[PDB]
Amino acid sequence: QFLRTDDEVVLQCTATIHKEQQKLCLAAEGFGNRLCFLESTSNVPPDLSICTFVLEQSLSVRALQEMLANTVHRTLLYGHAILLRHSYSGMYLCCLSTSRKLAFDVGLQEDTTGEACWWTIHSASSEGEKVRVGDDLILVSVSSERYLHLSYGNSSWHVDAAFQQTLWSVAPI
């Protein structure tokens, strides 16, 4: 099928270290420090509740930038900028100002009147083309131009906005 607005989705990525490969799910809590993290699966994550986002909006870069400039179930299209609402908290995936150290932190917030909560979707291989479920998506922050990135810390996997890309699977469920 195709990805549409109002869809409840789950973002997954593949984490391979020491030849050990696993699927990780993007997750977040609204109760406290508003940062996203990653869950292991199996491919179903233990706690799926907090791994659900809704594709609330889909606009063109020009449109979004026009709407914002004035202030001073559609199908998702490649190159378009989207808005992912976190179901549990009702807040939105955003690119923050604080650093993870070249990368920025990824978290949740409420105010969507800005670029920080907008992510343009690109293909790994299609401008304007329809976004089909099962495709590997690259997510770029409109505000910072950084990628939603799979990072590896001391002992665990983290998610941030870095200069390097990561392929994500935006599955419905």
Q: Which residue has the tokens 């907090």?
A: 50
Please, are residues 102 and 125 in contact by the beta-carbon 8 Å criterion? no
Quote the CA–CA distance of 26 and 53 in Å, as a whole number.
9
Strands 8-17 and 168-172: antiparallel
Experimental method: X-ray
Strands 157-162 and 168-172: unpaired
3-state secondary structure of 51: helix
Quote the CA–CA distance of 3 and 173 in Å, as a whole number.
12
- Domain of residue 145 covers 1-173
Quote the CA–CA distance of 118 and 168 in Å, as a whole number.
16
Domain count, the chain: 1
Q: Residue 121's beta-bridge partner residues?
A: 139
Closest by alpha carbon to 108, among 39, 166, 50, 25?
Answer: 50
The structure tokens listed for 88 are 């549990």
Distances 137 to 6, 54, 102, 158, 169 between C-alpha atoms, Å: 18, 16, 22, 18, 6
Residue 47 is classified by DSSP as -
Distances 127 to 38, 79, 130 between C-alpha atoms, Å: 29, 5, 9
In the chain, alpha helices (H): 61-69
Where residue 161 sits, what CATH number does that domain have?
2.80.10.50
Please report the resolution in angstroms. Answer: 2.4
Q: In this structure, how many other beta carbons lie within 10 angstroms of the beta carbon of residue 45? A: 20
Q: In this structure, how many other beta carbons lie within 10 angstroms of the beta carbon of residue 6? A: 11
